[PDB]
Design a protein around this ligand. Structure first.
Ligand SMILES: [Ca+2]
Ligand SMILES: [Cl-]
Length: 448
């Protein structure tokens, strides 16, 4: 059963379509969050995607036909498409867009200067004491749309409904904190049906505008998750994670979208150095295994490119599927969604979705933990310097199981491609996990 989505950051439509068919579908990912498909400013930086010019489907990712082709091919493969939608602003300054349209002085093909709030700057101190400025002033110079206007609402709603008509199943509302929750409620009343909607709201406490204000209009990004998980894995004890979630003051599990890192915080926007990313290698593997095994929120796996320390740089100059070879794992696309520990975690989550309880939690008071998901699965992480050899209790049927983080069950269920884990007649497992390693087993990866 589908439980996890992935952000194919800066991936073009051709690459996404092929990825859906060859990997995402077969591996069980539920959906793909794509980069903004609408017309945006010209330029090679990744952030040009966040400065809209119009709603025509011609962007760095491809043209309208290629976009439609991608939705169709992914849909047939069993994978949904979530579109990153810009509901708060339009591009700053003047220029030309990716579909040839010009703009300048708050004049665009679809908006006039009167469709925006009067210009003012959002200062850092405004976040803590002035909700009016946070929602009516400009985010880093971006023209702030009058989201209370019936015209503006109809225009954004037409775009969303158009995308639904061609097959899009979900939407990410970018910069939601900068738009009054009541404006979003009014916008949603114009949207057909009930697509999956998740709102980007960064709230780590002490904001004049809180994440809780957006719970009635859809799911909300829980940034406390990314930050605390990173902080605990680097500077704390994994044993503290026994009550992770609402117990730590996070929003309701059923309303949260979580992640180890996202495209912004892996670049220092909305997250400090404690955020764990692909650069951390094995540490990133372990952080993902915890997130995917733990029953809190709707997770999304990050899929990045090596930016070589340049936080403004756009993606690689080569496609992922290049003349027969995969441009993954090296200095171009990282493809974390293909890393064995991460893909194995997704498999574990997909196969334990019938039991959302954390059962039989065990820890060594520090960096060795193990817990189950009833009789559906069990896992363990060793982040100490010595082997984890403890005997832990499970609710699983005795037998042989493939450690899904390191391999998988063959078609005839006669063998695994990686190590085998044995569940004893009394439900116990005599662990044998080396330093900075883990194991995960589930009821549907049992040897015959
Ligand atoms: Ca605004
Ligand atoms: Cl996000």
């Amino acid at each position: 059963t589908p439980t996890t989505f992935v952000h194919l950051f800066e991936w073009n439509w051709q690459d996404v379509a092929q990825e859906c068919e060859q990997y995402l579908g077969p591996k069980g990912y539920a959906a793909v969050q794509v980069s903004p498909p609408n017309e945006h400013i010209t330029g090679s930086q990744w952030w040009t995607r966040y400065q809209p010019v119009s709603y025509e489907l011609q962007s760095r990712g491809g043209n309208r036909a290629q976009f439609i082709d991608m939705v169709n091919r992914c849909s047939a493969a069993g994978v949904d498409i979530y579109v990153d939608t810009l509901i708060n602003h339009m591009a700053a300054g003047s220029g030309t867009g990716t579909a040839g349209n010009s703009f300048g002085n708050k004049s665009f093909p679809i908006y006039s200067p009167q469709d925006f709030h009067e210009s003012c700057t959002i200062n850092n101190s405004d976040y803590g004491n002035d909700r009016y400025r946070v929602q009516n002033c400009e985010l880093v110079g971006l023209a702030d749309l009058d989201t209370a206007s019936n015209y503006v609402q109809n225009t954004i709603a037409a775009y969303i409904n158009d995308l639904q008509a061609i097959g899009v199943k979900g939407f990410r509302f970018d910069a939601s904190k900068h738009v009054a929750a009541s404006d979003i409620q009014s916008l949603m009343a114009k949207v057909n049906g009930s697509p999956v909607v998740f709102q980007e709201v960064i709230d780590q406490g002490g904001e004049a505008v809180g994440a809780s204000e957006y719970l009635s209009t859809g799911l909300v990004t829980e940034f406390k998750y990314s930050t605390e998980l990173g902080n605990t894995f680097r500077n704390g004890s994994l044993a503290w994670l026994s009550n992770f979630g609402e117990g730590w003051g996070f929003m309701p599990s059923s309303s949260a979208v979580v992640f180890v890192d996202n495209h912004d915080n892996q670049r220092g926007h909305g997250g400090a150095g404690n955020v764990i990313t692909f650069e951390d290698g094995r540490l990133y593997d372990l952080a993902n295994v915890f997130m995917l095994a733990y029953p809190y929120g709707y997770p999304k796996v990050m899929s990045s490119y090596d930016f070589h320390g340049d936080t403004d740089a756009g993606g690689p100059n080569v496609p992922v599927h290049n003349n027969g070879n995969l441009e993954c794992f090296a200095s171009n696309w990282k493809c974390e969604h293909r890393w064995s520990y991460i893909a194995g975690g997704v498999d574990f989550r997909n196969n334990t979705a019938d039991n959302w309880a954390v059962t039989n939690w065990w820890d060594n008071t520090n960096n060795q933990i193990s817990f189950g998901r009833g009789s559906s699965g069990h896992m363990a992480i060793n982040k100490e310097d010595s082997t984890l050899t403890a005997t832990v209790q499970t609710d699983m049927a005795s037998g042989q199981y493939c450690n899904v983080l390191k391999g998988e069950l063959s078609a005839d269920a006669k063998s695994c491609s990686g190590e085998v884990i044995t569940v004893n007649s009394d439900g116990t497992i005599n662990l044998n996990i080396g330093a900075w390693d883990a194991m995960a087993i589930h009821k549907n990866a049992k040897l015959n």
